[model samples]
Target chain A: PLTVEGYPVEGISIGGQETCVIFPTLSAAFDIGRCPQRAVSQEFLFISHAHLDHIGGLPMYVATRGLYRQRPPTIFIPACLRDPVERLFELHRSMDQSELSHNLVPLEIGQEHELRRDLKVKAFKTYHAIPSQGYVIYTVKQKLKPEYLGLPGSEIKQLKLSGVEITNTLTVPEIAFTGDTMADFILDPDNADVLKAKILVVESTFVDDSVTIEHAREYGHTHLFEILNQCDKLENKAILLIHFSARYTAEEIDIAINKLPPSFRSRVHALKEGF
Target chain B: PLTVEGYPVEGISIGGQETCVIFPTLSAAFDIGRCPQRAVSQEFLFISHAHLDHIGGLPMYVATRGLYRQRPPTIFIPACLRDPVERLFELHRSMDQSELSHNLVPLEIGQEHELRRDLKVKAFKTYHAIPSQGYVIYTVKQKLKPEYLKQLKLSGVEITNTLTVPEIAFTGDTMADFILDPDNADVLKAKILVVESTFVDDSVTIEHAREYGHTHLFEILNQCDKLENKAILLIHFSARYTAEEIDIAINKLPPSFRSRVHALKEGF
Candidate 1:
């Protein structure tokens, strides 16, 4: 992103050797931080539901963000889950006397929001027991429609002067961040936006075949085979899958992804241990 | 205080040890572990007040007495303190919920009532920032008047019985407990009682002396000279003072009543 000075204000810090994106300039993340100098970055908290480890950061996040109230960082949460999340803060007053409130943007499924002139993000529905959403962000340049493509500057300027509207709509595809969802969301090829993106991150929770598909379905989880099946003939710039159930080590996922067809095999990457 | 088997119940356990005096007992000390098991053997407890440590053990005591709901235990606490004490139970409800509401006999300070045969304990005036009172337990026994004593003949028919009274006053808190009239029927010459001697060392600030509503050792030294015919048990030592400190301080007083001045130790 370019700020008012036209300086490219965002930088990505590649994880040392391990290869996860480290947002360097952090202007793109939520602007709230415990210290103003450190306010450039915030944790991109993706929740897997109200499990303690997932929401336990809530109090510290609220207090730190509340340290600077004006234009406090916005928490992007599922629309239906926002009210209950706010109530959790209310219970603390009776348990401990403290105030916790912050700016939050609740995004519903199938809605598009303009983040910048060059960037747009569309939230889409994902199947999970609780409300879940997957988002695909696209960075595209504004281009004229096919009918007005190569008109001379004088003719186009006259058309504009005569009140003839020109169609210059955004057209681009950039990054897709799909939070936790079952393997079936990957099968929706054209709509899934997986093949259309330069980078894709998804979840494959289990690897052992002894675990029945019914059990994985019961937990709203996915087996690696389900993820492998989705990647059968699809081509993407990079596919990074994470949230592996604690069952398999790196050695196991390596041997399994190796057996896949060579074309599908190259882009598939399992998240490292402790991701 | 005789046990059912004819052995005398020794020690003050707050309240009655099941029908010794059959009267209302309402003397609360800073602690009752020693006082209840050692001081005066009386039936029942009328808690003169409530503070955390003061009434902390009442729940266990009530359960031990098996006075939960069946044969309810009579706990006489100040009426005004009822709400605050009940709320304390609710705040820690998970500790013991089923038995928190054991029978508590709440009484206003200064309300006098008959507690047992030949015994009456009336709450008396005392000063504390919180609800406070002193108690007067009159042990009534039959005795002839002086004129009647001279004329009475034990051999002729049955001699007439006249009521004579002895008093044991237990004051819960206050420097005022020490300031009671020396000759008042409410406190004069009361046998077997305890009082707080919180400030035995001169080094302890007199400011603390006033906060706990206690009589300083210097005041007691001057006052003990005037106390007579009463069995005095000095109690409630400040945690700061050692037993030897109290002994050394008492040794400075004149021998007129020094032998009667017994400083209390943790164990009886």
Candidate 2:
């Protein structure tokens, strides 16, 4: 799961680091989609693991951004995967330092990286066959104490002026995304840091008997059944479930998701094609 | 009817089938309508015969001649065909070479071939229905004549005083045409002979006879059509006849003239 839009959203599979997005509004949003006439400016790219497929499109993005005179995007990837990604970029001789002057920041799991004081991210271990991690986003807000719930605006201002400390903490879990991890990863305390985010994104790799449930666990992955079973724990502001096996058609996934309780279904979103 | 020049006589067709035209003069001369100098450099062209398929390519010949640094050609053609022939060149412009540079010269039908004494070519009163004529070129060569050949008997000083006159002949269209003309019958009596066979078919119609203005195998056979073993050739075949067809025709021709009929099979 990757972090996007200041919030850490666990929409992609476990170990899929949430993308840190800086879009301000829907109309002003930019889409780096392949078609022209779409938004072209993308400022940041964060990778969760060393997956070849995930890092392959990086050079193209970099080249396109360079062509458009966009400021080099800051790339953040897992600490362990930096060398491999760098080597991959070097193989395409034309994409060198002069061409791509983007800054790259590498971070290790369990480290607290501050994008800002109000919002910080922490990457936690994600169950995978390889080294993998997920991120959590915390949105810090100051709220009046319960005792001041009915206080007048003037009273509240007086209390603040008197230096009365806020009586309560108002913390909200913004989002979390798991790259590719077994169902157990969700409930695992080690993932408590990932699960508690308001928006959780995770993979539902297998949808049918074609992929045995045991095989999913063995591969350190999860199937749709595993995710559905954890429905109670999935009560987040918005659950972005992604990284489906190629076999399931969009219609099939839609039908299956419709079977969930209506309220829970509303909280679920599918990141689909032509997005 | 093209006005030709360099003939030994006033009116006759002159052609050489031997090594490089053994004479300096040709027979018959005429001219069609159009500009002379530029026509020699560029424009419409027509040919009276299909000898060597060479004459059929006159339009191209003139164009090829013009394409080079040399100027175009003031072309001469059979007078009976001036307008229709010029139109053919025009039609080809849109499809083939557009600037066919040549001038057309048309010689009157049945008129005397009196174009040039350089080639003393005469219009043969032949039976070929089309305005076809025959020409003959002489070896006028300005040599000592037969008398000079024997003068080696005398000293070089005496030989220097010998008189020389131009030797002469005809390029007959088709063989049977001249054979049927009694007055011009003797036109075949030349040191050299050039003619065409057209139809080698025994069952073909005479309508084809008038169409090509030439003879078929049966008519040629009836004409003797032998040249006393003189070098003779059969040309201008129907496009339908392949090489093999030509062989069959040759073997079927009168065996008496077989020795003289050199089949001109070389492609243009």
Candidate 3:
């Protein structure tokens, strides 16, 4: 498990192995991966795809929550995988004989799910070997309507008394997760907010020169060259990359990042726990 | 996981928590309690009861084998629990919607199932809060009828020779009463016997231990003279005891059997 300092993101990601991202403050986890003991309390889980490494621990996580007497978790997954994912859960329920209760949401791209009163999540396209999507968490803020921006407090109060709407809601993108994707994900106009999130957790699976960008994309993964050379496309406050391939030694990953141009390097944080 | 030194048996057991005893050599495990990463290789699992700590990892074990493209495991359990246990596996299969393929056998006390060529398991009644049974693995051997002791069954008496020796026995979370049950007499004869000693001293009396369907050390010591096993592997200690407390408690026992008893002490 890992924590991105100054932010609430903590998780474990080893490419082709496991990946789980936890947001304790939000009581949510992005992916169930290996289902560490700590993430069982997360009431919500977002599944990017049906990859075994990403969902190998799904049954365990679901079963554990039931074991400890917690209500079923609300699970969100790509609509493309809804059938099989549902089938998988059904099979687990049949086998365990326990009430592996859960709420499965088939969230399609471009759709938004209200997490709570102030927070919401929107799914976005992410090109991968399988049907996959990323998510962006947005915090809605109540701002005075533009027309009433300069209005006096008494006038605003009078408008409110008359039941005239004087406030507007603004969605501020806070965090984004690009589960396992290629650089082409950035080209989608609809994904503009994904790059603008306060924090971005993306996959840079291949970082060394031994792997070519074309080769990386062929496997539906992103290479460091693609990410670093196209840094202009990302406006995120911090872009944390994970899911490094097995070929990487932790220090080798850091070494590759340290070789980056100083300006590009300042915007990135690559997690080194899984290698 | 706990392993007996100079022996092939290994596993993990924590009282009122997880309990799994693996026999890699036997290609079997006594319980699917916590399904450690390594125990997956065993294709057969014998669960003692329906308690969560005894079978909580049932779904994970069955599903992971499917993920790896392996055959379903052959699981054996007490007949009394077959209905509930089968329902549990069914629920898991229904939930996962995968072919969590498995062969579940309902073996009641006194019945036997052969593992392979020479080994077989015989279930015997065990005292518990719920229906429970202990198991004894027996090794079958054959000898010449003429060498058999004084059996004149044949008018021209010719008798086929056979001998079954208790090899290993596991008393999966039972009250100390089984140790003195004449019907479960072979339990004491196995070469290696595994059982629980959840409480070690007067701090928790025998009455307190039995109230929870457990065996206290004092109870085990009471049956010392009746035990004839070549090895005793103790498991499932209460979490309240420290490694030092357990070591001292078991060390001060009757030295004869104390030297033979090996307690699985890690993660206590």
Candidate 4:
């Protein structure tokens, strides 16, 4: 019953009370609030923040790999939390007396790291009650430079052979994963990577109008309307909304979705139960 | 359904991979491997050991209570693990930039503690790869002594508040061989005994079972006559076995032991 869109690059959003997503094509998981059994296949885990709902299942995730003696996975987290997170791992290791094998990579704002030759990730600042960061994955591509666009194939080949700079490296922001943050993260002019991503997954914790924007901000969450208001600014091909507060029922979320403007409604989908 | 034995003391075992149970009447939960959403109502959590499957959900449990601004729950764990567990909580608190309100109480073997006026708990050692303890709950009762029973009609004045009866005993992931020891008298005297029988097939030999820190079918069967409790609830089956295989194994058990014993499967 639980399937995902953008097939061949399938991802399932499986957590509500706790939030986590598994992207098989990406070979990575974003946030490990609850380590869904199926997600152990992921080789990398990116944590957006330190909120319990965002990172509670970290121990389980690490231990699962150790239990089977699988290759240790690499976990990326906000740089500020590296020490505390390591302490957490140590605590569990001492208590369980088992060596939890994994790499804890810390990310800083504006730093880009390569996961592979073709895929790279950049961390960007996000507004949350705690120190948090969002990540954007980019696919590296090479295209002929503008000046070489009209050149014949033979001339381009010659230019390439002669070591002339005929091709330009293009970085396409493929996916943007915002674990928990307000709309300011995407709407800010400086965060073009998030605004220009091909697929965007963000939290929309509050949907009811009765819950004001201020309440969401106070809790370091995003309200549904804030995301709706910024839909025009979200240039992504697809927008996935997740981490809805347990307060709203499915019917209530559907009603909220009905209120979205026609232009943005089709591009938006709520990650609901069994999703 | 995995309904508990007592009427108002009903509990549900909410884990197949990570085992835990909530006792509403006792206002306490045991083994917080996966903190079920409903378990937030309880104010105390007793951890049997520090296995990943046993204590993994502790952060979520403590954080959930703190998130809702509820009075912090008191967690009881083995004394040796107190420092590490507290450090884990502190790490979370610092990272989340929030205060986690809870008490971490260290428990030791062969110790008795009072949970309430009428209820008390005692910890006993359990055989596991890691340091572990099992808990027994006793209900205190006051009655006239045997010598004073002859004059009961005339003497409403004499009564001895002495008898303590174990109402329930909870053992988390331990070899059943240890439960049969004479030193574990309170465990044998409990009215309802909840214990782990991780493997239910004779294919797992006693040697392998001992090596793996699990209780196999043979180990559990060998100690069946020792569980003097009225009801015996066995849990924590290996995922490798199917329902049919489990049923076949249980059917092969002695008929006398089968009547008082129940093998818990998934749902409840």
Total residue pair clashes for candidate 3:
38
The positional error of residue B7 in candidate 1, measured at the CA in angstroms, is: 52
Interface RMSD, one decimal, each candidate: 17.7, 35.1, 6.4, 1.7
Least accurate 10 contiguous residues by lDDT in model 1 chain A: A11-20
Q: Candidate 2, residues B1-268: lDDT per residue as tens digits?
A: 2111322211112121100111213311222111112223323232343231223223434444554545555444456556655654554343222476665566543343333443333344444434544444333223344555644635544443432222222333554656555665435665445455666776566567656555676665666644432555555565456668778877877667765565545321
Candidate 2 residue lDDT tens string, A10-106: 2122122212222222111111111111223546555555442234235545555665688776666668767655654443322122354566667
Query: Over the stretch B37-114, how does candidate 4's per-residue lDDT look in tens digits?
Result: 767778888889998778888888887888777789988888899888878878888877668789888889878888
* Model 1 stretches astray by more than 4 angstroms: A1-40, A43-53, A67-71, A93-101, A140-169, A188-190, A208-212, A232-235, A273-275, B1-268
User: How does candidate 3 fare on TM-score?
Assistant: 0.70
The lDDT, on a scale of 0 to 1, for candidate 1 is 0.49
- Which is better, 2 or 3, measured by TM-score? 3
lDDT of 1 by residue, B60-166 (tens): 34433342233434556666666654554343232222343445555666566665667766665555545655566666666654555423364574455646354
Interface DockQ of each model: 0.01, 0.01, 0.13, 0.54
Instruction: Give me the runs in candidate 2 sitting further than 4 Å from their true place.
Output: A1-42, A66-71, A89-99, A147-149, A152-169, A261-266, B1-268
The backbone clash count of each candidate, in order, is 12, 91, 38, 0
Q: Candidate 3's residue-wise lDDT over A83-168, tens digit each?
A: 76666566544433556788888889999998888999999999987788999989898899889999889998999899998888
- If scored against the real structure, what TM-score would every candidate get? 0.40, 0.42, 0.70, 0.89
Question: Could you tell me the lDDT of residue B112 within candidate 3?
Answer: 95
| Chain B TM-score by candidate, in order shown | 0.68, 0.56, 0.90, 0.87
Strongest candidate by TM-score:
4
